[PDB]
Symmetry: D2
Subunit: 330 residues, 4 copies
Amino acid sequence: MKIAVFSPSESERKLVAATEKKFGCELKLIDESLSAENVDQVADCDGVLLKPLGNLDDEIVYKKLADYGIKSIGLRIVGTNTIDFDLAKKYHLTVTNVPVYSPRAIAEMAVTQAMYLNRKIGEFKANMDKGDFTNPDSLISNEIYNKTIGLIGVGHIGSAVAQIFSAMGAKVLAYDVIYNPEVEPYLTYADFDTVLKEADIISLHTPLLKSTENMIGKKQFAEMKNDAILINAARGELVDTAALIEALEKHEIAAAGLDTLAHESSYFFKKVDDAQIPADYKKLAAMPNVIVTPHSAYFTKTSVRNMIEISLRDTIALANGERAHFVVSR
Amino acid sequence: MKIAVFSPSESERKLVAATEKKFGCELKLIDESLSAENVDQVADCDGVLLKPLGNLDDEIVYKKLADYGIKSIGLRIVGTNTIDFDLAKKYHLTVTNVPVYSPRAIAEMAVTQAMYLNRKIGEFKANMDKGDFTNPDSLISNEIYNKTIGLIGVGHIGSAVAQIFSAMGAKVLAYDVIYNPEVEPYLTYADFDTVLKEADIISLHTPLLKSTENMIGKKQFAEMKNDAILINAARGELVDTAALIEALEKHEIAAAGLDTLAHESSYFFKKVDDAQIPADYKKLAAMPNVIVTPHSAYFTKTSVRNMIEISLRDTIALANGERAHFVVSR
Amino acid sequence: MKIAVFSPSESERKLVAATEKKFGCELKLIDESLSAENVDQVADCDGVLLKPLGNLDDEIVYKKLADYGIKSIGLRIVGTNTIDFDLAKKYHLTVTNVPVYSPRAIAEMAVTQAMYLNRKIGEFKANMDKGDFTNPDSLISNEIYNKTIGLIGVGHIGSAVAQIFSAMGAKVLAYDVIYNPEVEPYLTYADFDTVLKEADIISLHTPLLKSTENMIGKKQFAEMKNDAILINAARGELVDTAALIEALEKHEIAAAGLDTLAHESSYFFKKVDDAQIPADYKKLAAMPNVIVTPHSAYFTKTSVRNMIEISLRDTIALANGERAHFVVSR
Amino acid sequence: MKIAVFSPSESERKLVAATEKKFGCELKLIDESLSAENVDQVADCDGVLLKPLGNLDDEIVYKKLADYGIKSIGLRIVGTNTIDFDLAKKYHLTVTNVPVYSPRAIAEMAVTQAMYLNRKIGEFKANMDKGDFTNPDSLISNEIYNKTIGLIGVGHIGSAVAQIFSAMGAKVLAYDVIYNPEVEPYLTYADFDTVLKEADIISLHTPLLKSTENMIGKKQFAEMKNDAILINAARGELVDTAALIEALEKHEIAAAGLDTLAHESSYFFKKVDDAQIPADYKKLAAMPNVIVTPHSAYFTKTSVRNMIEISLRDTIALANGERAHFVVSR
Ligand SMILES: NC(=O)c1ccc[n+]([C@@H]2O[C@H](COP(=O)([O-])OP(=O)(O)OC[C@H]3O[C@@H](n4cnc5c(N)ncnc54)[C@H](O)[C@@H]3O)[C@@H](O)[C@H]2O)c1
Ligand SMILES: NC(=O)c1ccc[n+]([C@@H]2O[C@H](COP(=O)([O-])OP(=O)(O)OC[C@H]3O[C@@H](n4cnc5c(N)ncnc54)[C@H](O)[C@@H]3O)[C@@H](O)[C@H]2O)c1
Ligand SMILES: NC(=O)c1ccc[n+]([C@@H]2O[C@H](COP(=O)([O-])OP(=O)(O)OC[C@H]3O[C@@H](n4cnc5c(N)ncnc54)[C@H](O)[C@@H]3O)[C@@H](O)[C@H]2O)c1
Ligand SMILES: NC(=O)c1ccc[n+]([C@@H]2O[C@H](COP(=O)([O-])OP(=O)(O)OC[C@H]3O[C@@H](n4cnc5c(N)ncnc54)[C@H](O)[C@@H]3O)[C@@H](O)[C@H]2O)c1
């Protein structure tokens, strides 16, 4: 039928025809995200796909959706915080989401950042920018199969990181609160401290909770090997940025790959002026042994494709009164 | 026994003591390369270990080796272009080398640079510098298991690139003029032209011969995919640098990672002033979709140790009358 | 505390001390499974672990459990059919289970059987038993990386089979009703018929439903490649045994590995006399190109360990009024 | 051109036509091995392709080759023990061979037999025959990623066994007298004795020399784990068959898979009567924890094709004056 798609990305636009054909449906793209202003635009539609910028706070929207026969909120993301479930239940609109879009995409960004820093390519470049094309011992590297990898958390994504590294021959240790037999071939569970002590490469794969805010701080960097490489492609708030920067400057660790940062929402996904970018980012950005990507581990064709198709699939099912995989409503 | 060592790296120095214990021999360390000037320091030595800066022109050195009972010359490296094998023969100096110190060192540089450029991490950084923290579609990436790898030449190193990439799920194609059943679990043989046409990532592993100089030029960039990544951790002269720069500038290929570059001799392995760095490097280094490392793919602990411990071991054998594994002709 | 363990296996007995220590609890093993007769034995216990032979039909058991403070039925299996949930809810006894004990154990049995039949070791043995130590062409094999694998269903177990085979270099196709991004690196989804047509090795990984009873029958064997190898380490009822036997005898397929068979419960896990074993089994047993194991893909140390520990873990939690992973009760 | 072929296998016959087209040459097929009796059939031939049953004793054959312009002798196999290299030299017959036709053929036999015996599939069958369909603890297995593999010798084949096993998650240890950096991602080097002590699965990949005959005897079985699996797809004479049988009978090791056996010449590759089969084979074949295959680890399509297409290719080159890759000394 006709499904409204709000807040389409440049990348989602490229998929529309394929998607229309595959699902035998029409997509109606609207350039802003859904809000009391432009809800009058789903009148001609049977369902709705959202990428909310900011909260759906008012109920004039939640009502007018019900009026037009819409029975679902189809989210093209994992995050649900913009969705007032108070109102959702009230108007009988269920909510679907997209939790798993591509674990390998994030995983591969993690491994990639780790590789580059291990090989010290940025430091070399910094050396070269100043005229130094030597091979000093300080920039000596090592084969990845001589490395121990430490995962904090596993999940779909950590599971994938281990698969990859273990496939290159590295030894992989993980701390976790749940035991999962699936990953045993690829890693060995150990506890938190042995993992911080013995890892050459550490990568974060922990959900953000009040209990894990700042779980990597000054104490942990000191416990880490001085030539270790931290990677955080999980949640910025897991790491104490200042403790990081300091650990970096005092050489208590060797490098870092960050696809997330605390207080990122202020500048990530945005165009901005110098005066708008925070100073901690600028510090990390100026370091040849640091990578920062703007939270784009996810950003592959498959992630983008799946974000559309999984959300559409569920949303159509609930337009037919059929059953949808990824509810979050009862 | 005592084996002399010429012109070690500062990281070669770091292993010395460990090597002495592990072999149970002494290592008379001389900073500068062997010459008529320092040849007499070998008097009290059994065998010799060589890293020649330059051609070994003088003959009075080859005589004096054989007058000191030196029965072989142990290249720590793979090159031979300074050994006058004619003089070696008269003085009955058998000549060993190290051809295989760490294929995976180099394979991993090549993989590492491919993944970084695939994830377009430097293009993201180039944006972030100008205030842009978005995810435009021009920087969308892909999972490695959706890419095709094309190898020109295989060899020890290429074989290793194929193992790793195919272990991450990629299709690996390879062109070679010699068949090796060993590598078929990891790749599929194809014609040169089909490799260029079909490969998303192309990595060169072809020796520099007279018939392979500028093997990749204008014609061949023309034949590649326009989102292709070209990796050269082999020999700079395999690639026509102007053809490459033009191809990059015109977006006829997507990225390149080069550990080696035509005309590098003049500045690789040196400290130099802006004026001494060529203009073709300055262009490449300015491109956020390019990586240049200073021929450091080899540079791991493992390599540095093997450069020493493999030469030593054939040098001690030949001194004891035994078999060396890496004797060399012409 | 003290947890009763009913119907302990010989293998579970070997784990008890380790388990007691790890969980800081006492295990009380009872040789029969739980029944109205011996329920008076959990009086001294705080929870209960079951391996039911046959249905828990009567409620004298379900009551007397409640009387003694027991708040859970802790199953050391996946199957719940013996559990009268009518009565469970009635006595406020929740039910836990063990769905995932070791996917790799089943997966590895599958791969193993497949390998052996591909290499034709049994046919060779049959040849040898008669005095033939030749290498006839009919018993020529091939490298596994020249093979295409077909999975019907994926799941945890199929996912694992693909990982392994793909790691050996084989091409892996799967049909499935759900899309799972996790397995894309290891297989390629295709539809049912292409998979039956193009696979050299096919393995079943489909749950038993009325819709999948006999889904492999005469029609399918005919569609399969004549030199293909079917493996069923899923559910016996998925395959039409007579259609199988016939396909085997007419050489419409080449071999089969079966850890399950229709009407197995009559003899599996049992000691029996010749007159007690069915004729279809005896036929398949007499074929050198057939393996039948008595439903023991699961049977490793890890499966057995996990079956105990996962069921104990949950069961203790519910003894404390804490939360248990694997409920099946509401 | 025309190349004669002597004593092809019936599976060698099957490839002939395909080979002719792929090379664009003829293949004059002669059933029996080259002799003074059939040497004259080569008159109209360019080069020759050899599978000698026996010693090439006569000299008048070597003369007549060189009178027919035959410049080389192309062994399709790896053996040389029937080539009188002395006579080859006078007649200027350069002598090629095939040492590397398919390392993975054999590696995969070795892996296949290890997994079958680890899963104890034959011990289960031995039980099922006697009416027992249970899962006693004496037949419990384990996941491959919990086992340690020990390789005595590496080589092309051993290297392949290490790749596969380490790709399934196992720890691989190897003893060798030569260092190869290439294999370090897949295994870790150790002493001979620590390999025997620590390995759950042991696979031999050591050439039969005078110094390796009965390399595995009573002493060494004594040193192995008592649930160890010994795999010999190398050369029978590496193992003391009586020591092995005694070790099995006494349960000093857990299983063995042998593709090769001391004194096999007398019955491997033949059809024979009970009376002609030795008693040490009869014992082994009776053990459900043993596998004997008739030296067929090599036997894949790929091998058979390479035995022909690698010899052909060096034989055509040498006939055209070009370089052969597998010329042989002594
Ligand atoms: N940068 C990105 O592009 C991006 C995108 C999506 C998700 N993420 C983040 O990456 C993480 C990994 O994703 P996933 O799908 O593999 O995870 P998941 O959410 O599927 O599973 C989380 C896992 O973390 C572990 N864990 C739970 N509590 C923990 C604790 N207190 N301490 C340590 N470990 C704990 C458990 O193993 C659990 O299974 C997510 O939690 C999310 O925060 C990042
Ligand atoms: N960047 C570094 O740090 C570094 C250091 C040392 C060596 N290298 C280079 O890495 C490269 C890969 O090494 P390798 O072990 O594969 O080399 P190798 O010498 O072991 O074999 C190279 C392969 O190239 C193939 N080849 C030959 N002629 C060819 C042609 N005309 N076209 C295509 N292929 C051809 C050969 O079959 C051979 O198998 C080599 O060129 C080596 O010089 C790089
Ligand atoms: N022999 C043994 O030792 C043993 C032990 C446990 C389970 N099993 C069997 O093996 C199977 C695989 O286990 P698992 O944990 O990987 O699976 P699972 O139960 O976790 O998942 C089942 C999967 O099968 C697929 N599927 C569902 N319906 C289908 C249909 N109609 N046609 C084709 N495919 C469909 C889906 O991908 C689904 O995810 C189980 O379903 C079970 O029957 C065997
Ligand atoms: N069963 C079959 O079908 C079949 C067919 C052909 C060959 N093979 C055999 O398979 C075996 C493995 O082949 P490969 O390619 O590894 O052989 P290879 O000749 O390539 O190398 C064998 C390795 O054994 C090592 N070695 C040498 N002396 C040793 C000693 N004293 N102790 C321990 N190790 C030592 C060497 O370092 C060498 O690396 C060989 O013995 C070969 O004869 C079997």
